[PDB]
Write a protein that binds this ligand. Structure first.
Ligand SMILES: CC(C)(COP(=O)(O)OP(=O)(O)OC[C@H]1O[C@@H](n2cnc3c(N)ncnc32)[C@H](O)[C@@H]1OP(=O)(O)O)[C@@H](O)C(=O)NCCC(=O)NCC[C@@H](F)C(N)=O
Ligand SMILES: CC(C)(COP(=O)(O)OP(=O)(O)OC[C@H]1O[C@@H](n2cnc3c(N)ncnc32)[C@H](O)[C@@H]1OP(=O)(O)O)[C@@H](O)C(=O)NCCC(=O)NCC[C@@H](F)C(N)=O
Ligand SMILES: O=C([O-])CC(=O)C(=O)O
Ligand SMILES: O=C([O-])CC(=O)C(=O)O
Lengths: 435, 435
């Protein structure tokens, strides 16, 4: 009775028509200007893509189809006896723009359990990888290796009419989301619980729950942490590295597997998703240098040393946000309720009072406030997941949700190849006169 | 005596200063405007990146550091007794902006031979991949898997000051370029010459030549074809999918291996580099449907069928070019001189007279002229490399040259995170009023 595919089939045509007419009336309307500095500056401040699933406000933070995080916490279906929103429902909301019912949500859950299966070549590959190969690298390679199963790649090669692309993107999106956790978990076990198995998927549990079982975690609060984690890391508008990467690559008709794997390569950058891991490594050195209960003056000292050494303070600053990230806050709130006395937490808490000030003092960062990465590993560490090099993988798993949600839309709406014009410094100097 | 690293060390500071002052004077100068339609249209027509290595003219075609293809053919060092430009020299030109000497060129050649070596984990991986896994997929996975050797990743993790990034990017760029051919060739042999070995690198040959030997080709004209192939496919300004992908991903500090592998995922799209393979598959069906010597009326018919079926005619059209691609011409010229009587060539030739007209007639394509992909496989087929699914790999190998050339520059000049602002249809309608 529930079928997202049928829902989308009705939704698509209405949106097509709506954009059609809009463009008819305003396609030539200018929404902005490009300056030299924006070009030199990684397009900062440039309105350059259409991304439907979420929109980030520099002051207010992210909105998913119009709903802020608190709204989601409050409207999205939760697990039986749960408090955290199920990621399944977030997906539904991104995809349809509507809040789902719990019945709808459980359908996603069954769908994802039904579709989870790995081909032997991928299993073999993971099991043969060396332990010194980074988790994100093993993840990306494995997703790329899964493209032999692409339904989209196969229909394209069969000559499918372009109007049906979305249909195949949809299938691969659902299959990929379903497989992610098994891939991710196999890496965790091969690297950290060598000789053990991830086991089987229980068609009866939610996605997060099957994930945590494959990861080998029993604590129920952990399961709750996971549901939240996976929901809040899902999407962050379209201009962020990982999302933009998936967009750009999918724009050339590369299948979802390939687009996703490229995005992961983007997420693995220190200035992007890798910050989650970097925050923890930074804290570890901290506590190692100074030792567990530091003084504010010593924290300042340690911050300055990093800055003076031509390095960044991980988990602070943002390309678009201008205030403290609601994702950070949302994590703080969870810590306060569940592990208020953790020393690491306490350390993170203390940094909140110091870091922004130092940054302000330094005078370079546009946004001195923390971002989501400043607070995530601390929560994970608490429950026993101390492998910091694996943290980004979790972020990867979550991000699939948003990026793949949009991906279907991009193909449904017929977005073309992303191909902007480049310029050389010399060509640009000429264009103007030069300086 | 020759050391590109030392040359760059002198070059870098001058460029820094030059951009500095320019920006001082014109950073706020507007170079363009953004309209609704550009946003909806994959940034078509938007000046959005700074890319130093090459600049594409919509009428004239690509210029590499100011030199057109004919100029390169004419100025770049050639092999002993050769006629085709060595890719090594093209690299030097991209990187320094200066035409190299043959002595310089031979240094690149030795450097690339010295640095070529694959780690066992990567070898193992390739050898375990299934035959149904696409060549581009095996390539991308393998490059990602090589990041365990990244010098840049390692120095970043050690806390290197940001001013030294280029130095490590440089090393990885050279190591990666050196390894590409071995990777590429191992895939070719595992897939198509099962049981044989790629052999060893001869520190005495040029890069293209060691490549063709590992591929198992003896014809000297083939070697010449390769040198040309690899030179002309090298770079195509910064807004193309693969280049932009590498740029965006490297912008987050992901290492060159990861940035390159993501670019490859971009290249593997049907609307991008995969067209080379698609052209051949299209021709094969053609000749199969119609049979070897077709009539113009039947060629038209066949073109129309494709178009009417919601498909693209591979190898025709371009996002920026408005006239026939000089890369196409350059290939035609080679065919005319070396395999003028090939039936396939002849077919390609015949299409040149028909395709653009049909396209013009259809009224959709902005550019009805052929692009580089319309002419490449035909040349390869002639020499015995009939595995069409492998063609994109060659394009991949070549592209490393341009993208990695720029990559060093991006980090030398301190380009920041690429992060434009996205918008939703609803947010945009509001911004205006809506249509
Ligand atoms: C996220 C970030 C790359 C945004 O960059 P951008 O919009 O260019 O930042 P900006 O305009 O404030 O930069 C102004 C100056 O302040 C510097 N600065 C910014 N954030 C800084 C930080 N956390 N520590 C030190 N210096 C910093 C920045 O590097 C720049 O210096 P240069 O002039 O020499 O280029 C940046 O604030 C940063 O480097 N953060 C540290 C890494 C991090 O936390 N990454 C995870 C981000 C998270 F949202 C995610 N998962 O994507
Ligand atoms: C390269 C290309 C994606 C540029 O796209 P774009 O700048 O959006 O093209 P455009 O502005 O002319 O498109 C106008 C219309 O003509 C259509 N059209 C363009 N080229 C076409 C072709 N070769 N066959 C059929 N229809 C085509 C295009 O799809 C579009 O239709 P919609 O309105 O329904 O979107 C495009 O011309 C194309 O689809 N080419 C066929 C694939 C190909 O040859 N790829 C290799 C390109 C090569 F340069 C490379 N290696 O990257
Ligand atoms: O929005 C961005 O630029 C980075 C970020 O926080 C994310 O991708 O979650
Ligand atoms: O320039 C582009 O958009 C595509 C192209 O021909 C290339 O990347 O070689």
């Amino acid at each position: 009775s529930t079928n997202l595919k049928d829902v989308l089939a009705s939704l698509i045509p209405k949106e097509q028509a709506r954009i059609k007419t809009f463009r008819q009336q305003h396609g030539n309307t200018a929404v902005g200007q490009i300056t030299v500095d924006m070009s030199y500056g990684g397009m900062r401040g440039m309105k350059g893509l259409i991304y439907e699933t979420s929109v980030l406000d520099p002051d207010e933070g992210i909105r998913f189809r119009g709903f802020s995080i608190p709204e989601c916490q409050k409207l999205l279906p939760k697990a039986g006896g749960g408090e955290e929103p199920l990621p399944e429902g977030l997906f539904w909301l991104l995809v349809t723009g509507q809040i789902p019912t719990p019945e709808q949500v459980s359908w996603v859950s069954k769908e994802w359990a039904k579709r989870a299966a790995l081909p032997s070549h991928v299993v073999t590959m993971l099991d043969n990888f060396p332990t010194n190969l980074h988790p994100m690298s093993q993840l990306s390679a494995a997703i790329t290796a899964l493209n032999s199963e692409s339904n989209f790649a196969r229909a394209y090669a069969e000559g499918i009419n372009r109007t049906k692309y979305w249909e195949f993107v949809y299938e691969d999106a659902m299959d990929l989301i379903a497989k992610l956790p098994c891939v991710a978990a196999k890496i965790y076990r091969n690297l950290y619980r060598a000789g053990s198995s991830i086991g089987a998927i229980d068609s009866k549990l939610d996605w997060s729950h099957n994930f945590t079982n494959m990861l080998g975690y029993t604590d129920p609060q952990f399961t709750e942490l996971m549901r939240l984690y996976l929901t809040i890391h899902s999407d962050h508008e379209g201009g962020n590295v990982s999302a933009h990467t998936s967009h750009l690559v999918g724009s050339a008709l590369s299948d979802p597997y390939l687009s996703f794997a490229a995005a992961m390569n983007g997420l693995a950058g220190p200035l992007h998703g890798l910050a989650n891991q970097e925050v923890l490594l930074w804290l570890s050195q901290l506590q190692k240098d100074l030792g567990a209960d530091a003084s504010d003056e010593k924290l300042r000292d340690y911050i300055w040393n990093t800055l003076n050494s031509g390095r960044v303070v991980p988990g602070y600053g943002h390309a678009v946000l201008r205030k403290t990230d609601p994702r950070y806050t949302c994590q703080r709130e969870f810590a306060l309720k569940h592990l208020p006395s953790d020393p690491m937490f306490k350390l993170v808490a203390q940094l909140y009072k110091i870091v922004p000030n130092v940054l302000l003092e330094q005078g370079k960062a546009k946004n001195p406030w923390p971002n989501v990465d400043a607070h995530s590993g601390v929560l994970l560490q608490y429950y026993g997941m101390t492998e910091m090099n694996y943290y980004t993988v979790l972020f990867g798993v979550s991000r699939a949700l948003g990026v793949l949600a949009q991906l279907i839309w991009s193909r449904a709406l017929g977005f073309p190849l992303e191909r902007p014009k480049s310029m050389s410094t010399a060509g640009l100097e000429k264009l103007s006169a030069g300086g």
